[PDB]
């Protein structure tokens, strides 16, 4: 199984419109765009992000899939964003939908924001924190915080883990891979997603730290 680069929208105006929905949602939350992990003051240094600290180990991203990741990042940088649209929904808040076809195994985005110790975030009200590193020593555990800086990943919806039929809404998956010895969090399509289809993944895919009883 190999990661696939996304196919960005052929129409330049369509890519502009897409990028604009993300810009609007970021501006709405008073956030700055960041397509990388940021290591801020009074938070975690880049040195703290070391994959050998993962309790039980972390799978390594292969050379083939790293080139795929770099290819997607270069595309984002040049202007070829993934074919995603940020759309406000009254029942979910901001959501992400496919604004083009996304085949199975296609790289969607990296989960970005500020990396901080879980110990500095135990009572943080941010509705979008994501576990980065789960260390044996709980003072070494890290969390991604897209409260001030972040990308599209933080707007992607989750499934209700309590309903009999909610698992059916899941069309993408959040995995953690080792890249140059560091922890990285990625989103990948788990099935062929059509234009307009809402992206959903399991927020409780390893731990069960996110309350989903009320999700739609």
């Amino acid at each position: 199984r190999r990661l696939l680069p996304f196919v960005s929208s052929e129409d330049p105006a369509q890519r502009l419109k897409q990028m604009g929905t993300l810009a609007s949602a970021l501006t709405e939350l008073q956030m700055e765009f960041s397509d990388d992990l940021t290591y801020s003051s009074g938070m975690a240094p880049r040195s703290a992000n070391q994959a050998r600290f993962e309790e039980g180990g972390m799978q390594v991203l292969t050379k083939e899939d790293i080139e795929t990741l770099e290819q997607c990042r270069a595309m984002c940088k040049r202007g070829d964003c993934p074919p995603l649209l940020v759309v406000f929904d009254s029942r979910e808040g901001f959501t992400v939908e496919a604004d083009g076809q996304i085949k199975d195994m296609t790289f969607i985005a990296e989960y970005t924001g500020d990396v901080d110790y879980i110990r500095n975030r135990e009572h943080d009200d941010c509705d979008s924190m994501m576990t980065l590193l789960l260390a044996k020593d709980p003072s070494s555990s890290l969390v991604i915080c897209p409260d001030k800086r972040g990308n599209i990943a933080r707007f992607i919806s989750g499934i209700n883990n309590h309903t009999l039929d909610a698992k059916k809404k899941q069309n993408c998956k959040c995995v953690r891979y080792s890249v140059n010895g560091e922890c990285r969090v990625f989103l990948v399509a788990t099935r062929d997603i059509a234009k307009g289809e809402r992206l959903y993944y399991d927020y409780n895919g390893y731990e069960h730290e996110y309350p989903t009883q009320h999700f739609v």
């Binding site: 576990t131 989750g158 995995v175």
Partner: peptide
């Protein structure tokens, strides 16, 4: 009064599929 903190988590083994 009591302060609680929601966190997403992802597997670090098993690949995508």
């Amino acid at each position: 009064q009591l302060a609680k903190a929601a966190r997403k988590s992802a597997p670090a083994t098993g690949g995508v599929k």
